[PDB]
Amino acid sequence: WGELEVQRVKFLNYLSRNFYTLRFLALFLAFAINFILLFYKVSDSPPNMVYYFLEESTGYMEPALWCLSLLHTLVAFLCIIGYNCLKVPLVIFKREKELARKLEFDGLYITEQPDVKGQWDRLVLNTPSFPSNYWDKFVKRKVLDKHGDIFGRERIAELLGMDLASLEITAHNERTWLMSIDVKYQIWKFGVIFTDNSFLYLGWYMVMSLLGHYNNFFFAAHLLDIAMGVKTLRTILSSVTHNGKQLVMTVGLLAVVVYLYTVVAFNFFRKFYNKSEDEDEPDMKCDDMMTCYLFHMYVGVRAGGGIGDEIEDPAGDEYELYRVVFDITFFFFVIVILLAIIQGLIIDAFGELRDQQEQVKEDMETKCFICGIGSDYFDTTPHGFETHTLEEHNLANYMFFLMYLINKDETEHTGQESYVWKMYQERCWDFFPAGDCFRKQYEDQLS
Amino acid sequence: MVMSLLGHYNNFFFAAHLLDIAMGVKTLRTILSSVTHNGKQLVMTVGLLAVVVYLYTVVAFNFFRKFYNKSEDEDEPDMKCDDMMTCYLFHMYVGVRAGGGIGDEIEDPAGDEYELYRVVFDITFFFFVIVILLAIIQGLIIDAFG
Amino acid sequence: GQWDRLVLNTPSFPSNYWDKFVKRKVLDKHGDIFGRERIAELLGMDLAS
Amino acid sequence: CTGNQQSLAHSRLWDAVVGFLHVFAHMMMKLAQDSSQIELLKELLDLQKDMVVMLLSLLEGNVVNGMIARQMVDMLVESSSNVEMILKFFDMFLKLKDIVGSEAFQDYVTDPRGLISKKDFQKAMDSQKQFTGPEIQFLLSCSEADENEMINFEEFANRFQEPARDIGFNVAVLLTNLSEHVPHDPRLRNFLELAESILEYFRPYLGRIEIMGASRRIERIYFEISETNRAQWEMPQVKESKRQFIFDVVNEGGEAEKMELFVSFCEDTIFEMQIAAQISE
Numbered sequence: 023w024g025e026l027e028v029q030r031v032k033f034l035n036y037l038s039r040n041f042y043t044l045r046f047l048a049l050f051l052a053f054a055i056n057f058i059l060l061f062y063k064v065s066d067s068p069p070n071m072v073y074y075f076l077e078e079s080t081g082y083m084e085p086a087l088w089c090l091s092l093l094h095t096l097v098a099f100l101c102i103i104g105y106n107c108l109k110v111p112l113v114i115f116k117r118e119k120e121l122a123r124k125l126e127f128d129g130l131y132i133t134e135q136p137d138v139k140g141q142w143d144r145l146v147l148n149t150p151s152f153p154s155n156y157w158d159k160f161v162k163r164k165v166l167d168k169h170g171d172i173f174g175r176e177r178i179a180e181l182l183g184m185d186l187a188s189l190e191i192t193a194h195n196e197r198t199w200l201m202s203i204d205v206k207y208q209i210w211k212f213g214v215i216f217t218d219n220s221f222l223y224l225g226w227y228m229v230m231s232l233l234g235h236y237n238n239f240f241f242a243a244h245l246l247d248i249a250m251g252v253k254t255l256r257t258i259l260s261s262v263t264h265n266g267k268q269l270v271m272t273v274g275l276l277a278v279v280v281y282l283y284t285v286v287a288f289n290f291f292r293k294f295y296n297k298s299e300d301e302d303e304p305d306m307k308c309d310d311m312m313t314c315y316l317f318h319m320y321v322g323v324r325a326g327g328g329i330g331d332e333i334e335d336p337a338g339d340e341y342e343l344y345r346v347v348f349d350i351t352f353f354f355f356v357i358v359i360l361l362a363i364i365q366g367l368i369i370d371a372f373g374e375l376r377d378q379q380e381q382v383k384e385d386m387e388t389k390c391f392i393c394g395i396g397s398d399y400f401d402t403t404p405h406g407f408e409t410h411t412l413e414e415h416n417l418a419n420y421m422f423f424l425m426y427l428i429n430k431d432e433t434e435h436t437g438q439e440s441y442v443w444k445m446y447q448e449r450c451w452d453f454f455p456a457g458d459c460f461r462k463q464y465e466d467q468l469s
Numbered sequence: 470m471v472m473s474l475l476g477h478y479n480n481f482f483f484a485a486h487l488l489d490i491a492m493g494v495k496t497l498r499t500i501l502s503s504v505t506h507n508g509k510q511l512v513m514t515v516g517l518l519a520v521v522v523y524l525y526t527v528v529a530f531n532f533f534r535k536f537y538n539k540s541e542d543e544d545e546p547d548m549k550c551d552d553m554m555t556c557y558l559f560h561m562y563v564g565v566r567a568g569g570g571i572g573d574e575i576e577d578p579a580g581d582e583y584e585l586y587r588v589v590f591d592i593t594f595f596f597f598v599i600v601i602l603l604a605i606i607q608g609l610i611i612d613a614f615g
Numbered sequence: 616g617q618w619d620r621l622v623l624n625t626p627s628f629p630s631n632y633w634d635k636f637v638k639r640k641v642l643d644k645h646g647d648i649f650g651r652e653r654i655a656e657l658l659g660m661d662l663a664s
Numbered sequence: 665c666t667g668n669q670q671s672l673a674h675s676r677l678w679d680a681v682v683g684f685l686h687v688f689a690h691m692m693m694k695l696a697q698d699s700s701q702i703e704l705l706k707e708l709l710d711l712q713k714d715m716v717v718m719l720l721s722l723l724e725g726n727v728v729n730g731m732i733a734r735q736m737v738d739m740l741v742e743s744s745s746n747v748e749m750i751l752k753f754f755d756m757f758l759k760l761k762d763i764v765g766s767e768a769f770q771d772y773v774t775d776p777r778g779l780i781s782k783k784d785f786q787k788a789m790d791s792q793k794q795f796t797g798p799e800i801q802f803l804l805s806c807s808e809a810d811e812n813e814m815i816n817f818e819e820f821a822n823r824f825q826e827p828a829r830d831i832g833f834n835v836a837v838l839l840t841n842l843s844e845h846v847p848h849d850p851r852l853r854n855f856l857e858l859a860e861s862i863l864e865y866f867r868p869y870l871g872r873i874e875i876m877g878a879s880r881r882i883e884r885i886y887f888e889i890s891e892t893n894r895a896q897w898e899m900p901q902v903k904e905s906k907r908q909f910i911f912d913v914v915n916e917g918g919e920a921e922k923m924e925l926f927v928s929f930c931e932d933t934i935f936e937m938q939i940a941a942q943i944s945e
């Protein structure tokens with residue numbers, strides 16, 4: 023069992039270093055099976071309607087599409103197990119980082135009580151494999167030494183799942199692999215992975231690829247990956263939901279205006295509505311109101327010139343001036359304004375979202391991300407802002423300070439490094455400069 | 470120079486030298502340079518409009534194929550939605566040009582068979598490819614020109 | 616960068632330029648850190664000695 | 665503590681450190697002429713490692729014109745002879761791996777076994793202007809003779825890199841700390857041109873960072889970046905999380921909570937390189 027286990031971690035590691043290459047071939051083969059699908063044909067003749075493939079001087083295309091569909095479902099399943107190998111330890115680590123500081127600092131589950139995320143997280147405090155994917159594992163003794171005097175300590179120990187709290191603490195002071203696994207922790211960890219929006223998109227990608235063997239026309243929806251893949255065409259799709267509250271009421275407003283335009287047409291202008299050009303077989307559409315309201319919202323918002331394009335002309339003397347005012351105020355409202363409100367609502371939503379992606383780049387190229395002085399102060403010396411960025415205030419040096427403080431001992435720290443280390447563990451950020459960086463206070467005494 | 474010497478072969482080849490007005494004055498060069506100033510963003514939207522219309526033809530090929538018939542003669546029937554490469558060429562030629570959707574060139578859904586599926590199908594096709602995506606493209610050049 | 620390699624070995628390099636002693640600028644600058652016979656064969660200087 | 669640093673400045677510590685710099689500069693050019701004297705020379709390089717961090721801990725909380733830095737530099741110009749011998753030591757043995765790394769000097773040797781003679785390598789290093797006349801017979805006297813036909817340039821290069829990595833880094837840190845604290849000094853400007861190579865070699869390994877504490881005074885904090893930490897920093901999976909984190913802070917993130925998000929971004933990247941170091945081949 024030892025050789026099969028190391029062959030499993032060799033296959034899982036070989037796949038995860040090629041995670042970007044594997045999805046490149048997953049999209050290339052996704053576009054390859056939908057390019058060849060353009061040559062389908064329906065016929066009454068055999069090869070009811072049948073779906074047979076047509077090709078000129080090539081008979082290899084039908085075994086190819088059967089080969090690429092099994093190759094796409096295989097490569098999609100390796101992508102799921104790859105995302106279940108690589109980024110799912112990352113997505114738990116940000117949640118048990120936020121909760122373990124939510125438990126100890128402000129006390130989310132000990133002094134107050136709550137959101138579905140607050141009550142789903144109750145299944146993870148009583149497992150002993152709580153800090154298993156976290157750098158801090160003494161978090162439960164942090165909060166019992168903090169809030170174990172104000173309340174009953176036996177109740178908070180039963181809340182925190184600490185097995186033998188008066189015996190394991192004395193044992194730590196002085197001195198069937200699946201059956202050893204916790205069933206409450208893995209049902210909890212499989213619950214939050216299902217909350218993740220990327221995995222339900224990756225889960226939608228695999229469940230439709232396996233549905234593509236039932237009908238090969240189901241491979242069409244994987245070419246909508248170009249909308250979510252590149253960031254250019256995702257701002258077009260996210261602009262619909264960015265201002266989606268304002269759009270659903272305007273189409274709600276357009277629904278009640280057109281329904282108020284059909285009721286006036288149903289009571290006074292009903293003899294005009296007749297699309298049938300045959301005299302003996304008359305089809306008057308304005309006889310039932312649910313029939314006619316479906317007729318208005320299908321041709322009236324599509325014609326561009328109002329409802330009167332599909333209706334006979336008002337050359338008759340009966341209701342000649344009422345109708346000619348009726349179509350004009352209908353054309354002025356639903357197409358000229360309300361349909362220009364909707365395209366007036368998405369394109370500036372599309373316009374503003376790209377304006378905030380360009381201003382993020384511009385303000386980053388101007389301000390310093392750490393201290394509160396612009397790039398106009400550092401214009402006194404040439405290349406002063408790049409000297410202020412790369413050498414003095416760099417975001418990579420602030421991490422490189424941190425992991426250097428992780429690796430070295432507490433008895434090897436100097437006074438400046440032990441001061442920022444004690445200020446970081448109680449989580450206060452007054453050690454950052456924020457508006458002065460060696461060129462405002464010593465500006466007269468350095469030349 | 471190479472097109473002016475080609476103009477003696479056919480004198481209609483002298484037409485392309487009147488595109489010098491686009492590059493000569495700086496006024497009409499910003500209209501021509503605005504296409505290539507934001508040319509990366511435009512080629513993906515027409516790439517996005519290509520895969521939405523192709524996803525609109527596959528739904529029409531499997532469920533709405535008996536509706537597509539431009540022939541007004543009963544004995545000689547021309548059903549365009551029989552081959553998919555024929556029909557996908559039909560959608561990107563009349564559907565993005567009509568201004569009111571694909572349903573202008575197709576018979577009305579007064580029949581009871583697929584009466585509510587089709588009337589929702591044309592509306593969400595008209596709402597996407599003309600009202601938004603074709604206003605995205607003219608929304609992309611004019612502010613680039615602006 | 617690679618098309619410009621065909622112009623260092625011609626003697627009519629500075630012919631349309633105001634500076635013509637450019638090859639003796641760079642041999643007096645980088646002729647001690649490397650082999651000077653190699654940089655003279657790179658610069659096309661016919662009979663540099 | 666301001667009390668001890670004025671007590672060490674007013675004591676006779678400076679003639680002790682000058683005398684310790686005198687015995688260190690002469691023994692390392694005496695103990696480098698034999699291969700059985702390696703244990704004493706590493707123990708000495710760890711000892712002058714301990715003094716320069718003692719000298720760096722004296723310079724903590726130092727004002728841009730303070731007396732600790734000026735009594736540190738006059739101690740250095742009272743003792744010019746030996747600290748130039750320590751920085752010439754760290755220069756000639758760091759330059760040689762850049763010298764033996766050239767394509768010319770590996771083309772001058774044609775032995776298949778790799779044991780180059782002593783006369784051919786002496787005329788080769790004399791052809792380059794980076795090394796001098798009395799320098800090269802010092803380096804062949806420090807090398808293994810082996811009947812004047814085997815110098816073994818590979819083992820002579822990596823011999824004094826690993827014991828002299830930490831001290832060669834910290835005398836580089838001591839010079840850059842004193843230069844940017846007290847400027848406009850010609851004798852310190854004498855010292856950085858004399859030790860230019862140990863600064864440019866340790867520039868991507870030195871990180872300069874500033875914090876603000878101790879009665880609102882900004883100080884410059886100096887630390888070390890190892891080679892493993894920066895090699896995993898410039899990988900595409902790490903910078904793609906960097907590109908989106910910069911985006912979600914200046915666009916929608918707050919002003920006071922942006923440094924709380926920065927440290928939450930920092931601890932996440934320690935973990936994602938730790939899961940990357942676990943999955944590395």
Ligand SMILES: Nc1ncnc2c1ncn2[C@@H]1O[C@H](COP(=O)(O)OP(=O)(O)OP(=O)(O)O)[C@@H](O)[C@H]1O
Pocket residue numbers: 386387388389390391392411415416417
């Ligand atoms: N700590 C900082 N404070 C303020 N501004 C910073 C800081 N770090 C970087 N910047 C600014 O943001 C930019 C970030 O550059 P980034 O690494 O994202 O891309 P880049 O410079 O184009 O990379 P490369 O050219 O190496 O591919 C810097 O060039 C600088 O203008």
Ligand SMILES: CNC(=O)c1cc(Cl)cc(C)c1NC(=O)c1cc(Br)nn1-c1ncccc1Cl
Pocket residue numbers: 042045046047048049101224227247248249250251252
């Ligand atoms: C947002 N969709 C995905 O995450 C995605 C998810 C799955 Cl299951 C499969 C594929 C092919 C996906 N699509 C990409 O993964 C992808 C689409 C585009 Br367009 N580009 N692109 C990409 N991006 C970076 C590196 C390599 C690639 Cl291939």
Ligand SMILES: Cn1c(=O)c2c(ncn2C)n(C)c1=O
Pocket residue numbers: 157428931932934935
């Ligand atoms: C290993 N390790 C970490 O990985 C870590 C940390 N603080 C944050 N992190 C992420 N500390 C103190 C630590 O010892």
Ligand SMILES: [Ca+2]
Pocket residue numbers: 432433434435436
């Ligand atoms: Ca200490």
Ligand SMILES: [Zn+2]
Pocket residue numbers: 390392393410414415459
């Ligand atoms: Zn700054």
